[PDB]
Paper text:
The C-terminal WD40 domain of LRRK2 is required for LRRK2-induced neurotoxicity and has been shown to mediate the interaction of LRRK2 with microtubules and synaptic vesicles. The structure reveals a canonical seven-bladed WD40 fold and a surprising dimeric state in the crystal.
We determined the WD40 domain crystal structure using the single wavelength anomalous diffraction (SAD) method and refined it to 2.6-Å resolution. The first six blades run from β2–β5, β6–β9, β10–β13, β14–β17, β18–β21, and β22–β25 continuously, and the last and seventh blade contains β26–β28 and β1 from the N-terminal end to complete the fold, forming a stabilized ring-like structure. There are two WD40 domain monomers in the crystallographic asymmetric unit, which are related by an almost perfect twofold axis (176.3°). The dimerization interface is large and buries approximately ∼1,200 Å2 surface area per monomer. In addition to surface area burial, a number of potential hydrogen bonding and salt bridge interactions exist, among D2388 of one subunit and H2391 and S2345 of the symmetric subunit, among R2394 of one subunit and main chain atoms of M2408 and Y2410 of the symmetric subunit, and between E2395 of one subunit and Y2346 of the symmetric subunit.
Numbering used by the authors:
A (entry chain A): 2141 to 2158, 2164 to 2253, 2259 to 2305, 2314 to 2395, 2408 to 2462, 2468 to 2477, 2488 to 2496
B (entry chain B): 2141 to 2159, 2165 to 2251, 2260 to 2304, 2314 to 2395, 2408 to 2420, 2424 to 2476, 2488 to 2498
Amino acid sequence: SRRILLPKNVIVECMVATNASIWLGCGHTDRGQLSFLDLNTEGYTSEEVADSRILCLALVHLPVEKESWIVSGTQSGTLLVINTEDGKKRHTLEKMTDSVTCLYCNSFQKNFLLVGTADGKLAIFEDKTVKLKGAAPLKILNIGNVSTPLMCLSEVMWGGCGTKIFSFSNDFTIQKLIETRTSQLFSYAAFSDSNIITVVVDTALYIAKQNSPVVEVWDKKTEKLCGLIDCVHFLREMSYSGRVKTLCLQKNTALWIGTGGGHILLLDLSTRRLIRVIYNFCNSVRVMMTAQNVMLVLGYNREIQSCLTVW
Amino acid sequence: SRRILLPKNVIVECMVATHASIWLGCGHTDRGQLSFLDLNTEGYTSEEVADSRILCLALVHLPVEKESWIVSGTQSGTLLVINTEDGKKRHTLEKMTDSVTCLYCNKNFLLVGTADGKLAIFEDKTVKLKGAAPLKILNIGNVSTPLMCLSVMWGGCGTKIFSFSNDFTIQKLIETRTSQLFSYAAFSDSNIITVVVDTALYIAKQNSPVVEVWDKKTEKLCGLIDCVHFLREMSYSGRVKTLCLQALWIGTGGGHILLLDLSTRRLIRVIYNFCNSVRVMMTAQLGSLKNVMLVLGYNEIQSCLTVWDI
């Protein structure tokens, strides 16, 4: 477990891992700046590659043809594809009608690039088609509207659009559509009327909402509330907001929760709840993800100092 | 609405009103101290009447024979009955096997819940007889599940809600620990301290900021009210101490009082820092057509009784 300090005032919007290194989208700038961080040497390099802020990143790897492409989704809707080995090899896919708010690589075996936009749409690209300039998506799913951003995808595929959880499979048709805005069992109603920010898929669906300390648990079959995890009460065992910022699952049993503060919770998902709790791990946990085995946690302190902890 | 300051360092464990004045059990003392407060003159008098702390009060009124008796249940299990008009008329009913933790007036009956999970029933008249035995004793729980609230009659024993109507059968027996799946597990694993019955059951648990709402028929959770989250619209504990129906009043461990709607579970009113700690909140009839709201709080201790009309 070591901490890697990023250059001062660097803000990280998005992050993807691959001498291990990571690609970063920068949020301290209104244009599209792509950064590269060597985890072994802690070296940081960046380049302006697009006209609008890079919101989300995805790494498309082609085992045949031996090529890795880094895909940047931007605030203007542009999908910029850049070659990992030769930066002079870069092009743009079809422009989205709104900002790109989600990038996921799925596999069905066929691999795909799923592109969620801010106007509630989900564009699907095939593995190979990412190499082609001006490439069009195989299909576009109109799941929401301009007011329901599609912000998270997890793996059948589950996703969050506004206050709705959606599911889709091979044919890319929306099978399950679950409205989470209403439930009589809600400990508090105002938290549940927020956009879903993250979805982790285990035996049940564990979702988090914007500016909400309550992780909701919904059932895949019955499409109803399974349970509630109130981070405020777990933290208090006292002025913590408990606002959930990120969810990360372990091998099978454990769930990491990064809160608005620097607090990280580790709960068991089988018969009890609380395993571990680290207070003031940073000032604010922003991103938490697994990579290949390894745990990456991006937090920031505030001038702004972003840090990447890894164990 | 007017507030009456009790003498300094007086602690009120239990409370019952009559017509206006109130009877108080004192908690600042290890023996059984009964106090009397005139709501018109704010005059306070007290007397040591028992050997152990008076935990509960009940006022048995007999319309025929025209007699009012004040019954005190104590920490040793003693049930002391005293005449309202003549204090020299006092006696003791059958000793309970453990401390008396609940006294309710319900043909009229006196229900006596104890700390070892038992409920003794006395008839209206039998309260006048020295050493009188109860009509029946229901063993609902055990030494570890005290019976602490009564409100058909519903009651709370440990983490279980029980029901009974004609005194010889426990009708409903509902385990409320099952709500571990929602909001918080440690809060739901606590003894029920108060129960209010309107259409669903609104229960509160010891050291819990979550008022649970259960269904009478399906015997399952209807909803949850988290006082911490309602108060935050910041270090408030939100620990519920008292529930009252009017709308639902909630007095918290702090000095905070919430007034929520039932049909819609929406927030009507919120009074912050009403005192340092709300302890009791109840309705009383101070005379003919006189419905009144009494709130006992405390603030080195200063207990106060706020009183307003409904």
